[PDB]
Amino acid sequence: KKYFMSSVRRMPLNRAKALCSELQGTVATPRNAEENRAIQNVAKDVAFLGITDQRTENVFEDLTGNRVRYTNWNEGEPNNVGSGENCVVLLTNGKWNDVPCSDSFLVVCEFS
Amino acid sequence: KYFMSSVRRMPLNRAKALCSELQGTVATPRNAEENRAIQNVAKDVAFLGITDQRTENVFEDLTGNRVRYTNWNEGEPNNVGSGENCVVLLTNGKWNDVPCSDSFLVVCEFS
Numbered sequence: 525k526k527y528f529m530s531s532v533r534r535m536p537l538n539r540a541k542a543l544c545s546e547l548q549g550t551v552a553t554p555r556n557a558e559e560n561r562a563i564q565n566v567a568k569d570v571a572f573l574g575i576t577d578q579r580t581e582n583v584f585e586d587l588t589g590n591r592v593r594y595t596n597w598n599e600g601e602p603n604n605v606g607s608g609e610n611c612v613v614l615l616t617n618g619k620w621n622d623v624p625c626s627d628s629f630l631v632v633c634e635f636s
Numbered sequence: 637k638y639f640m641s642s643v644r645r646m647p648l649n650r651a652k653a654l655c656s657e658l659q660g661t662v663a664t665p666r667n668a669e670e671n672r673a674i675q676n677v678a679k680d681v682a683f684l685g686i687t688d689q690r691t692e693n694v695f696e697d698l699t700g701n702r703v704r705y706t707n708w709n710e711g712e713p714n715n716v717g718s719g720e721n722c723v724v725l726l727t728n729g730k731w732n733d734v735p736c737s738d739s740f741l742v743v744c745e746f747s
C-alpha cells in the first residue's frame with residue numbers, strides 16, 4: 525500500500541521533491557478520496573502535493589509528467605493568480621489550491 | 637514499522653535530521669527479522685539508530701533505551717582509533733561500531 529509522511533519544515537516545491545527523493549519516495553499524489561483523506565490525516569497544515577501544470581497551463585500532471593484524473597479543488601480553484609500558480613497544496617479542509625511553486629509549505633511524501 | 641534508505645551518505649547528525657524531518661527515526665532493529673528488512677532496503681553500509689555516546693560500551697537507541705538484540709560482526713564492537721560511538725549495518729547484515737563523524741547511508745524507520 526502507499527504510506528504517507530509529513531515534513532516538519534516548510535519549503536518550496538523543488539526542495540520538497542528533493543526531500544522525498546532522498547528517501548526514494550515522491551511528493552504525495554492522491555489518486556482518489558481515500559488517499560486524499562489519508563494525506564489529510566498526516567498533514568497538520570497546508571502541504572504540497574506532487575501535481576503541477578508547469579508544462580501546459582490548466583493541464584495538471586503528477587511530478588512524472590503523467591496527467592492526473594482525480595482532483596479535489598477548493599471552490600474557485602484553480603485560479604492561477606498573479607504571475608502564476610503552477611503547484612498544488614492540500615488545504616486543511618482537504619480541498620486543493622493552486623499556488624506558486626516558489627512559495628513554502630509543508631510537504632507530504634509518499635512511499636510504497 | 638516501515639524502513640526507507642537514503643541514496644546519499646552523511647554523518648550521523650545529518651542522518652538523524654533527515655529521518656526526523658519526516659517524523660521518523662534512524663532504524664533500530666529489535667530482532668533478526670527487522671535486521672534483515674533493514675539490510676535489504678540498504679544497498680550499502682548504513683547507520684542504525686544506536687550509539688554508546690552517553691556511556692562507553694553501553695549501546696542504546698536514539699531515545700536512550702538500552703538495546704537488547706545485537707548483531708555485532710566478529711571483533712566488534714571495538715571502539716578503535718580515538719573512538720567509535722555510532723553503529724552501521726554492514727552488507728552482510730552484521731554490525732560495526734564507527735565514528736559518528738564518518739559518512740554512510742541512512743535507513744529511517746517509521747510506524
Ligand SMILES: OC[C@H]1O[C@@H](O)[C@H](O)[C@@H](O)[C@H]1O
Pocket residue numbers: 601603605609621622623
Ligand atoms: O495569496 C492568497 C491567495 O492564494 C491563491 O492561491 C488563492 O487562490 C486565493 O484565494 C488566495 O488565497
Ligand SMILES: OC[C@H]1O[C@@H](O)[C@H](O)[C@@H](O)[C@H]1O
Pocket residue numbers: 712714716720732733734
Ligand atoms: O577504519 C577501519 C576499521 O573500522 C573499524 O570500525 C573496524 O572495527 C575495523 O575492523 C576496521 O574495519
Ligand SMILES: [Ca+2]
Pocket residue numbers: 577581582604608609610611622
Ligand atoms: Ca497554473
Ligand SMILES: [Ca+2]
Pocket residue numbers: 601602603604605609621622623
Ligand atoms: Ca489559487
Ligand SMILES: [Ca+2]
Pocket residue numbers: 688692693715719720721722733
Ligand atoms: Ca564507543
Ligand SMILES: [Ca+2]
Pocket residue numbers: 712713714715716720732733734
Ligand atoms: Ca569498529
Ligand SMILES: [Cl-]
Pocket residue numbers: 719720721722734735736737
Ligand atoms: Cl564516535
